[PDB]
Design a protein around this motif. Structure first.
Motif, PDB file in Angstrom:
ATOM      1  N   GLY A  23       0.809  -1.217   0.000  1.00 60.48           N
ATOM      2  CA  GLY A  23       0.000   0.000   0.000  1.00 60.48           C
ATOM      3  C   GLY A  23       0.838   1.261   0.000  1.00 60.48           C
ATOM      4  O   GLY A  23       0.568   2.182  -0.772  1.00 60.48           O
ATOM      5  N   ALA A  79       2.436   2.018  -3.358  1.00 63.52           N
ATOM      6  CA  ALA A  79       1.465   2.614  -4.273  1.00 63.52           C
ATOM      7  C   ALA A  79       1.133   4.087  -3.995  1.00 63.52           C
ATOM      8  O   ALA A  79       0.901   4.826  -4.949  1.00 63.52           O
ATOM      9  CB  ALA A  79       0.179   1.796  -4.250  1.00 63.52           C
ATOM     10  N   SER A  80       1.025   4.500  -2.718  1.00 66.59           N
ATOM     11  CA  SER A  80       0.667   5.882  -2.360  1.00 66.59           C
ATOM     12  C   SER A  80       1.932   6.709  -2.039  1.00 66.59           C
ATOM     13  O   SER A  80       2.156   7.767  -2.636  1.00 66.59           O
ATOM     14  CB  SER A  80      -0.330   5.894  -1.197  1.00 66.59           C
ATOM     15  OG  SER A  80       0.166   5.213  -0.058  1.00 66.59           O
ATOM     16  N   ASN A 131       2.205  -1.756  -8.444  1.00 66.06           N
ATOM     17  CA  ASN A 131       1.688  -0.398  -8.294  1.00 66.06           C
ATOM     18  C   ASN A 131       2.756   0.464  -7.605  1.00 66.06           C
ATOM     19  O   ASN A 131       2.902   0.414  -6.388  1.00 66.06           O
ATOM     20  CB  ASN A 131       0.345  -0.394  -7.516  1.00 66.06           C
ATOM     21  CG  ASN A 131      -0.510   0.838  -7.705  1.00 66.06           C
ATOM     22  OD1 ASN A 131       0.010   1.922  -7.987  1.00 66.06           O
ATOM     23  ND2 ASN A 131      -1.836   0.704  -7.396  1.00 66.06           N
TER      24      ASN A 131
HETATM   25  C1  LIG Z   1      -2.769   1.748  -7.079  1.00 61.81           C
HETATM   26  O1  LIG Z   1      -2.300   2.526  -5.972  1.00 61.81           O
HETATM   27  C2  LIG Z   1      -3.129   3.673  -5.703  1.00 61.81           C
HETATM   28  C3  LIG Z   1      -2.452   4.490  -4.621  1.00 61.81           C
HETATM   29  O2  LIG Z   1      -2.597   3.911  -3.327  1.00 61.81           O
HETATM   30  C4  LIG Z   1      -4.536   3.218  -5.329  1.00 61.81           C
HETATM   31  O3  LIG Z   1      -5.385   4.350  -5.152  1.00 61.81           O
HETATM   32  C5  LIG Z   1      -5.097   2.348  -6.441  1.00 61.81           C
HETATM   33  O4  LIG Z   1      -6.377   1.856  -6.053  1.00 61.81           O
HETATM   34  C6  LIG Z   1      -4.151   1.184  -6.735  1.00 61.81           C
HETATM   35  N1  LIG Z   1      -4.698   0.356  -7.800  1.00 61.81           N
HETATM   36  C7  LIG Z   1      -4.542  -0.972  -7.864  1.00 61.81           C
HETATM   37  C8  LIG Z   1      -5.314  -1.670  -8.945  1.00 61.81           C
HETATM   38  O5  LIG Z   1      -3.804  -1.581  -7.095  1.00 61.81           O
END
Ligand SMILES: *[C@@H]1O[C@H](CO)[C@@H](O)[C@H](O)[C@H]1NC(C)=O
Ligand SMILES: *[C@@H]1O[C@H](CO)[C@@H](O[C@@H]2O[C@H](CO)[C@@H](O[C@@H]3O[C@H](CO[C@H]4O[C@H](CO)[C@@H](O)[C@H](O)[C@@H]4O)[C@@H](O)[C@H](O[C@H]4O[C@H](CO)[C@@H](O)[C@H](O)[C@@H]4O)[C@@H]3O)[C@H](O)[C@H]2NC(C)=O)[C@H](O)[C@H]1NC(C)=O
Ligand SMILES: *[C@@H]1O[C@H](CO)[C@@H](O[C@@H]2O[C@H](CO)[C@@H](O[C@@H]3O[C@H](CO[C@H]4O[C@H](CO)[C@@H](O)[C@H](O)[C@@H]4O)[C@@H](O)[C@H](O[C@H]4O[C@H](CO)[C@@H](O)[C@H](O)[C@@H]4O)[C@@H]3O)[C@H](O)[C@H]2NC(C)=O)[C@H](O)[C@H]1NC(C)=O
Ligand SMILES: *[C@@H]1O[C@H](CO)[C@@H](O[C@@H]2O[C@H](CO)[C@@H](O[C@@H]3O[C@H](CO[C@H]4O[C@H](CO)[C@@H](O)[C@H](O[C@H]5O[C@H](CO)[C@@H](O)[C@H](O)[C@@H]5O)[C@@H]4O)[C@@H](O)[C@H](O)[C@@H]3O)[C@H](O)[C@H]2NC(C)=O)[C@H](O)[C@H]1NC(C)=O
Ligand SMILES: *[C@@H]1O[C@H](CO)[C@@H](O[C@@H]2O[C@H](CO)[C@@H](O[C@@H]3O[C@H](CO[C@H]4O[C@H](CO)[C@@H](O)[C@H](O)[C@@H]4O)[C@@H](O)[C@H](O)[C@@H]3O)[C@H](O)[C@H]2NC(C)=O)[C@H](O)[C@H]1NC(C)=O
Ligand SMILES: CCC[C@@H](CCO)Nc1nc(N)nc2c3ccccc3n(Cc3cc(CN[C@@H]4COC[C@H]4O)ccc3OC)c12
Ligand SMILES: CCC[C@@H](CCO)Nc1nc(N)nc2c3ccccc3n(Cc3cc(CN[C@@H]4COC[C@H]4O)ccc3OC)c12
Ligand SMILES: *[C@@H]1O[C@H](CO)[C@@H](O)[C@H](O)[C@H]1NC(C)=O
Ligand SMILES: *[C@@H]1O[C@H](CO)[C@@H](O)[C@H](O)[C@H]1NC(C)=O
Ligand SMILES: *[C@@H]1O[C@H](CO)[C@@H](O)[C@H](O)[C@H]1NC(C)=O
Ligand SMILES: *[C@@H]1O[C@H](CO)[C@@H](O)[C@H](O)[C@H]1NC(C)=O
Ligand SMILES: *[C@@H]1O[C@H](CO)[C@@H](O)[C@H](O)[C@H]1NC(C)=O
Ligand SMILES: *[C@@H]1O[C@H](CO)[C@@H](O)[C@H](O)[C@H]1NC(C)=O
Ligand SMILES: *[C@@H]1O[C@H](CO)[C@@H](O)[C@H](O)[C@H]1NC(C)=O
Ligand SMILES: *[C@@H]1O[C@H](CO)[C@@H](O)[C@H](O)[C@H]1NC(C)=O
Ligand SMILES: *[C@@H]1O[C@H](CO)[C@@H](O)[C@H](O)[C@H]1NC(C)=O
Ligand SMILES: *[C@@H]1O[C@H](CO)[C@@H](O)[C@H](O)[C@H]1NC(C)=O
Ligand SMILES: *[C@@H]1O[C@H](CO)[C@@H](O)[C@H](O)[C@H]1NC(C)=O
Ligand SMILES: *[C@@H]1O[C@H](CO)[C@@H](O)[C@H](O)[C@H]1NC(C)=O
Ligand SMILES: *[C@@H]1O[C@H](CO)[C@@H](O)[C@H](O)[C@H]1NC(C)=O
Ligand SMILES: *[C@@H]1O[C@H](CO)[C@@H](O)[C@H](O)[C@H]1NC(C)=O
Ligand SMILES: *[C@@H]1O[C@H](CO)[C@@H](O)[C@H](O)[C@H]1NC(C)=O
Ligand SMILES: *[C@@H]1O[C@H](CO)[C@@H](O)[C@H](O)[C@H]1NC(C)=O
Lengths: 748, 741
Positions: A282, A285-286, A315
């Protein structure tokens, strides 16, 4: 010569190496002017104030791993050593910190002992300590007490720069730490919470290791106890507020789900951040914390996979573009099926990102064109994935990963390296290497590749200089194989025996001659015993050929002349390895057809019962001859007539029971002679003595069954006369007879 | 006692084994009543009339490979006093001529691998009792040698000659005037380019004829090969085999044949075995008029008949293959074709006795496996060494053109129908891979680059597999239900699947072992197993044997780790356990005490054990074999009787034991202390003991060896093998001698 130690002056200080010599006590025959003494790996059981009696200039002592089959140290044993600065006492089963240690100590290592109480009586007088290691005293399923640290025990150590308390049950960060600290190791200490006070005033701290506190225990290769409910380490928002000089931060295996960006607000120089074995998919990704790390050069986010989830993509936050100083990124064990071009856009403008490590992710597909858009990638490490064709614990090592290089330095020295080893690229199609950069080092080892290379597979990457194709099932059935790689210098075809071992299929190695710059060729462990049409290997450029693990016993069969000049055509060859070829004898005609340009010839680990020494006359440049691990019974008595260039002669692990009289007469060039592990009962003075200049500097004789009667006196007198020739492992140059001296060294 | 030979009475005759004992001459200490003497592989250089003096009842002598390098000189009439000598083997002796004055009583004479280029009447015409005469491999390949001259009518007087072998000699023609008593005639690799009607005239008793290697097919030959002018075929006249009515074996391998004359077999109704390997018969396999003349044929070998440069899509076999009613085995290796369709093998499906089909080395990529269901009774389907991918030096007494070993391991084939798909590219087993296959009991998928996670569904279409070999793959053991669909599985071989086990970061699951109700043998060797996920124990109520060699028990039984302390305790029925090659310097006492109490054989060889706690053998009341060879043990217990009363075999060779304790029990039959550091055996150490090995110990032959020598004389019932290798190390004047001198 010194005994039992190997004394050497390098450069101002005199070092004495007495390690691993089964010494029952410290030897009283160590040189008076020794400054650094290494007595590790012995059977020493006691240390007293008389142990280091006449060694007043002793600055370093290493008594690690003593005994081997606990070390008893009297109070104030090293107290007379007024110059002692470094004292290593690791793996000694010490129950307490030795009493009366000298005030002059700057480094003290008490790693791997049973020390559970850090007291003022033990260390408060050691005000000159810079480095203090107390790691690995209570850990894993070892039966041990909780570590009690006396209040303010480290407070008086005003010069302490390094303190390591890792792999001990602490529960809390010890209070009252000296502000001089630069490196603080608290890995695997059961510290579940870090408050604002724990690292207060540590303004000189450059390294902090808090790994293994609240560990991620799923699939752990070691005993692992997680925090209550697999909870994260609890680090207060202001825990690192005075750590302005922090360069290294290790938070691996702390079960982190969130990274507080405020942790790095007062940390502008953070260079290395380890976040391996956490739950940060997580945060990857963020990643708000990525905007706070402008100086970061190494980021390790390996093994942060979600258990039970094999997603389609990785991600990566756009905030990875803020890591401007990034040099290396480790994203092993994230676990995802495909890598698309848009997924790595945030890393494409980083100017110094030279390494991307995506090993062990179970990746099946990659858009290789994505690596072209990077500023200057030098190492693309994709080893150990599922890529298919295009359609015990060392305390002074990193506990969570290997610190070895990803690519072999010899391969990476040529330029851009692409490691695709341990994948499933069983067939290289016409567009497999399309859209790749100017790759100079390519590794396709262990890809189950059983194809017939035909001279077109690597045309899209023609500047490969080092190609590793080991551990495949390659079918060498076409004379144009690999010829498109015109500038190829190193080729490794080791462990591709699958088709070579079948007599009925065809085998073609003619492509070797077509390279103008091929320097190194490794054909080891290919079980080569038969070739089709061309029986000779030819090359005007080849310098080294490794032919170990093949069948020269079959190729040089007495009733077959076809492979008699198999290596003659390698006109520039200087190094040749014929080891592990089951050779009981080499025909004279076959030995005479080896390249005359040879400087190093290895014929070790064969079954040679005889060697025709006379044939060395046709090798005027032979410097190294290695015949170790054979069954040779005799040596020539006139080696000077056959060679005047041989520098190294390795004969260990043979059945030589007599050294010929005048064996080294007029040889002159010989520097290293290894006759260890043979059947020599004695050495006559005449077998070694010489009337000409002698360059002999090394003579190995350990493992010979020496008969220590008065007949060994001529050799002992020779040893005293020639101190310039070093005889290593003098404690292993043991007498076999008579009974009263059966286990003793020759010197007695 | 016996020295230097190992004399044994089995059963009426007394045999003496004196081979490979570096004997410089024939020993004059051989038992007077010996009947068969084996002196092969020694450094014997001379044979005279005095060599075998006092061995009157000698019927067999083997002097092969003598001298075995630093030629055998035999005087004329050396074996002439041996009136009972029947068998005389004189192979690989560098003999330049047939020995003169050989005894008339000889029934078998082997002179293979010598430099004999003239077969003369003075040498063999007086040997009228000869039944078997071997003169093969005297002039062949790039050996510098003369052409073989056979004196006219030399074999004519040998009226009882049944076997004559002249293979691997330069003959050019079939020797004339051969005795009609001949049953087997070997003329392989003899440079005989033409066979006329007269060559095999009057050989009405001939059951075997070997004419292989005459006009050979030399492309890609693994040996020196000289073809006939223009790669021409052997020229066999239409009536060459007219009188060979009793022929059962015919070898025409590597004779460059393009056509098979069907008239060759018109008067040969009993032909059973026909070898036609390494010829150019793809056309004859497709048309095959000769196949209608072979009703009694049981074995047909048409291997390596491929056309150079042609990789066709299909195999073309003639409908006349349906006339081979007695066929038992068909070898079609090296034909070379891409796909095997079901209609391509229709001509073989009604043959009643065809139990073996061998299609190895054909580069086959696809097979319609439903084709094997229509066969009468196939027992061995050998498809090893092909390119099958997922569904969308020379021993003279051996066969020169192929290995005669079994295609499948007998232990696997004993369960029933065997399917060998080893050395292929079945890297993934899909849901319909084994669809439409017969009731396969033995399956081999070794070396298929298989890196998949078996999940319990891959073998559901062949659920009666009893012996499964999955060695030399990259299997990812990541699912507890792997192989559980094979509910009757008895033997499972997972050797050499270390790829994923060596990675700590990936998960490893071996829980599937407990779910088998009849699993008897499990081999996990060379898997580098050092870490498991969730379940750290191996469990099985049925398992009898576990091979755990080549793993990392040094890591699993790390002193600070308790997780794998009972790793084998759950194998409640285990009798045999192999822990060799596990880098064990020591085994924790708790780990040894948790080994199954049902153990009868425990191997812990080739580790680095410096100590062994003998006391712990008390908890193994059924231990019969303890193997600790190749370790670094320095000491032995002085009270083994208190710890065991069942141990029969104790192997301790290649250790550092320098002293035998006082009193060194009743159950012990075999004690191996060879290659240790024993200087002597004292009277303190000196019963079902029948074997004691002591070769390779540094014996001080001075004083205390007299006591051990006396013990050897008193106990003739205990055999000490390799008495020539039980050598003295000291003093100098007896350094190389055996202790019994
Ligand atoms: C990718 O990471 C973003 C940031 O946290 C998140 O909002 C998004 O849902 C993620 N998408 C997937 C498919 O993992
Ligand atoms: C197939 O065959 C090839 C060719 O032999 C193998 O590749 C070679 O492997 C050897 C052995 O690992 C390599 O040699 C080693 O190189 C090390 C690094 O060398 C650097 O540092 C030296 C200075 O120390 C520089 O001069 C040099 O330019 C290098 O950049 C050395 O550290 C090694 O040690 C040497 O010295 C020590 C003593 O200090 C001795 O104990 C050693 O024996 C040795 O003399 C050693 O030299 C070699 O570089 C490799 N060549 C290439 C082209 O890669 C493959 O490994 C083999 N494949 C398989 C699968 O087996
Ligand atoms: C599934 O399919 C695979 C692949 O075809 C089969 O694997 C083969 O199995 C056979 C039988 O086990 C293997 O053969 C063995 O090779 C060993 C190693 O090679 C030695 O070669 C020389 C001698 O020629 C030695 O000098 C050298 O040091 C090597 O170690 C041999 O040791 C084995 O010898 C056995 O027989 C002799 C007597 O002839 C005894 O003295 C030995 O003790 C021993 O019992 C043997 O020859 C072969 O290598 C495997 N091939 C491959 C590619 O792996 C599977 O068997 C098959 N499974 C089933 C169920 O059928
Ligand atoms: C292309 O990719 C391939 C695959 O990734 C690369 O291959 C690897 O290359 C490295 C470097 O050469 C190899 O590492 C070697 O490992 C040797 C040890 O091997 C075992 O055997 C020894 C006995 O023969 C034994 O002593 C040793 O045990 C000890 O060390 C272990 C750790 O190394 C430890 O776990 C044990 O407990 C014990 O202490 C081994 O188990 C070593 O001797 C060498 O010095 C060297 O380190 C890898 O094994 C290779 N991996 C594979 C899968 O083949 C290849 O280099 C790449 N090519 C290029 C051009 O970069
Ligand atoms: C993985 O482990 C397996 C289990 O140990 C290995 O299989 C075993 O291998 C051994 C050694 O080769 C075999 O034992 C030999 O068997 C032969 C034949 O015995 C049978 O036939 C003879 C007559 O010919 C008869 O007298 C016997 O009673 C037998 O019924 C013996 O001649 C040998 O001396 C020796 O005992 C095992 O039989 C075999 N077991 C099985 C279940 O196959 C396997 O090889 C290992 N795999 C690898 C890759 O190493
Ligand atoms: C760092 C790797 C660690 C482990 C973690 C697994 O808890 N993963 C893997 N460990 C091994 N040894 N093999 C594989 C593997 C092989 C091929 C393709 C992907 C593979 N993964 C990836 C993965 C797969 C699943 C689906 N697997 C199920 C169960 O069994 C049948 C399949 O249907 C779930 C999660 C996951 O990783 C998070 C793994
Ligand atoms: C008993 C096997 C003997 C040899 C004989 C070679 O005259 N065959 C093979 N030998 C080896 N070592 N490998 C293979 C091989 C690998 C995959 C698929 C088929 C394969 N064959 C089969 C074969 C192929 C061709 C095409 N080959 C060219 C050359 O290089 C590029 C290819 O396009 C022509 C004839 C033929 O068999 C007659 C062979
Ligand atoms: C060693 O210390 C003891 C006291 O523990 C003392 O009696 C003795 O004299 C000391 N000897 C030396 C050499 O310092
Ligand atoms: C260490 O040994 C000395 C004697 O050599 C003794 O005085 C001391 O009590 C011993 N200490 C321990 C803990 O064994
Ligand atoms: C503290 O030192 C005392 C005295 O040696 C000892 O009894 C105690 O066990 C030590 N603390 C720990 C936790 O071991
Ligand atoms: C920080 O380190 C420097 C030396 O690099 C030292 O002079 C200074 O006093 C240290 N600060 C404190 C508060 O100890
Ligand atoms: C980039 O790398 C170079 C060379 O190592 C270095 O001099 C430079 O300062 C680095 N710059 C950044 C932005 O990291
Ligand atoms: C090598 O393969 C290519 C096709 O890929 C072909 O042109 C060439 O002739 C092959 N070599 C031989 C000698 O078959
Ligand atoms: C080898 O090099 C020569 C000269 O450049 C070239 O003519 C030939 O085609 C090359 N061989 C192969 C197999 O590509
Ligand atoms: C011969 O090898 C040397 C290195 O030993 C190299 O400098 C030279 O260029 C090579 N010659 C050829 C023809 O490639
Ligand atoms: C050494 O080789 C030469 C030349 O081939 C040969 O004359 C000589 O006999 C050989 N020596 C031995 C002992 O084989
Ligand atoms: C065989 O040796 C004997 C002497 O032992 C001698 O009479 C005879 O001529 C020798 N023959 C040959 C060919 O060496
Ligand atoms: C054929 O063999 C039999 C023995 O099986 C023998 O009696 C008969 O005489 C032989 N025929 C000839 C013509 O030698
Ligand atoms: C099949 O085998 C049996 C038993 O060996 C035999 O009696 C029968 O004749 C064979 N079938 C044919 C057609 O030869
Ligand atoms: C094994 O794989 C099957 C699907 O092939 C799945 O149903 C099963 O849950 C897997 N086992 C585990 C524990 O993941
Ligand atoms: C063995 O256990 C596995 C995993 O639960 C299961 O799939 C399989 O059906 C079981 N075997 C039998 C015979 O039920
Ligand atoms: C235990 O093993 C024996 C063979 O030693 C076998 O007869 C018996 O059936 C096995 N028991 C179980 C529960 O499988
Ligand atoms: C043998 O094992 C027993 C039981 O664990 C133990 O008490 C004994 O000390 C062991 N012997 C040795 C010498 O370690």
């Amino acid at each position: 010569r010194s005994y039992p130690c190997d004394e050497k002056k390098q450069n101002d200080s005199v070092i004495a190496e007495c390690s691993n010599r089964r010494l029952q006590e410290v030897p009283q025959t160590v040189g008076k002017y020794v400054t650094e003494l290494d007595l590790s790996d012995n059977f020493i059981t006691h240390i007293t104030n008389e142990s280091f009696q006449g060694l007043q200039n002793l600055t370093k002592i290493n008594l690690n791993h003593n005994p081997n089959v606990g070390l008893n140290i009297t109070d104030g044993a090293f107290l007379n050593l007024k110059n002692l600065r470094e004292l290593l006492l690791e793996d000694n089963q010490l129950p307490q910190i030795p009493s009366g240690l000298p005030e002059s100590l700057t480094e003290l290592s008490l790693i791997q002992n049973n020390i559970y109480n850090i007291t003022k009586e033990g260390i408060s007088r050691l005000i000159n300590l810079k480095n203090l290691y107390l790691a690995w005293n209570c850990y894993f399923n070892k039966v041990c007490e909780k570590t009690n640290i006396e209040d303010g025990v480290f407070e008086t150590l005003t010069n302490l720069e390094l303190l390591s308390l890792s792999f001990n049950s602490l529960s809390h960060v010890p209070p009252k730490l000296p502000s001089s600290l630069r490196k603080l190791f608290l890995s695997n200490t059961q510290i579940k919470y870090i408050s604002e006070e724990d690292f207060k005033g540590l303004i000189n701290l450059t390294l902090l290791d808090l790994s293994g506190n609240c560990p991620r225990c799923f699939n752990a290769p070691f005993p692992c106890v997680p925090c209550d409910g697999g909870a994260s380490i609890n680090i207060d928002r202001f825990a690192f507020q005075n750590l302005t000089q922090l360069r290294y931060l290790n938070l691996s295996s702390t079960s982190l789900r969130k990274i507080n960006a405020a942790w790095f607000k007062n940390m502008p120089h953070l260079k290395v951040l380890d976040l391996e074995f956490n739950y940060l998919v997580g945060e990857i990704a963020s990643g708000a914390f990525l905007t706070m790390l402008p100086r970061l050069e190494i980021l390790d986010l390996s093994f942060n996979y979600i258990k039970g989830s094999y997603p389609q993509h990785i991600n990566i936050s756009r905030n990875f573009s803020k890591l401007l100083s990034l040099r290396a990124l480790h994203l092993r064990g994230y676990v995802f099926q495909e890598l698309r071009e848009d997924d790595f856009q945030p890393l494409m403008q980083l100017p110094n990102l030279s390494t991307i490590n995506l090993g062990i992710n179970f990746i099946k597909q990659i858009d290789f064109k994505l690596f072209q858009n990077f500023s200057n990638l030098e190492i693309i490490y994709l080893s150990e994935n599922r890529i298919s064709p295009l359609v015990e614990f060392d305390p002074h090592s990193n506990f969570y990963h290997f610190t070895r290089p990803l690519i072999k330095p010899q391969c990476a020295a040529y330029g851009k390296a692409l490691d695709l080893s341990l994948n499933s690229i069983f067939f290289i199609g016409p567009n497999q290497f399309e859209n790749l950069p100017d790759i100079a080092c390519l590794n396709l080892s262990a890809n189950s590749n059983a194809q017939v290379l035909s001279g077109t597979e690597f045309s899209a990457i023609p500047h490969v200089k080092y190609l590793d194709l080991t551990n495949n099932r390659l079918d060498f059935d076409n004379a144009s194989a690999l010829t498109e790689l015109s500038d190829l210098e190193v080729l490794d075809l080791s462990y591709n025996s699958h088709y070579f071992r079948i007599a009925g299929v065809t085998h073609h190695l003619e492509f070797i001659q077509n390279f103008t710059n091929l320097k190194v060729l490794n054909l080891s462990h290919n079980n080569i015993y038969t070739l089709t049409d061309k029986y000779n290997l030819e090359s005007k450029s080849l310098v080294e050929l490794v032919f170990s693990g093949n069948r020269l016993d079959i190729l040089w069969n007495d009733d077959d002349n076809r492979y008699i000049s198999i290596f003659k055509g390698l006109k520039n060859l200087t190094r040749l390895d014929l080891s592990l070829n089951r050779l009981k004898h080499i025909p004279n005609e076959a030995f005479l057809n080896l390249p005359a340009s040879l400087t190093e010839l290895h014929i070790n680990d064969n079954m040679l019962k005889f060697f025709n020494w006379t044939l060395l006359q046709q090798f005027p440049r032979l410097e190294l001859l290695d015949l170790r691990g054979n069954k040779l019974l005799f040596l020539t008595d006139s080696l000077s007539d056959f060679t005047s260039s041989l520098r190294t002669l390795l004969l260990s692990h043979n059945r030589i029971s007599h050294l010929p009289s005048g064996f080294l007469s007029e040889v002159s060039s010989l520097k290293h002679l290894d006759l260890s592990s043979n059947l020599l009962k004695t050495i006559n003075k005449s077998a070694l003595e010489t009337k000409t200049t002698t360059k002999l500097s090394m003579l190995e004789l350990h493992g010979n069954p020496f008969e220590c009667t008065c007949d060994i006196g001529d050799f002992r007198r020779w040893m005293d006369e020639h101190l310039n020739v070093k005889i290593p492992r003098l404690v292993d140059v043991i007498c076999a007879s008579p009974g009263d001296q059966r286990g003793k060294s020759i010197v007695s």
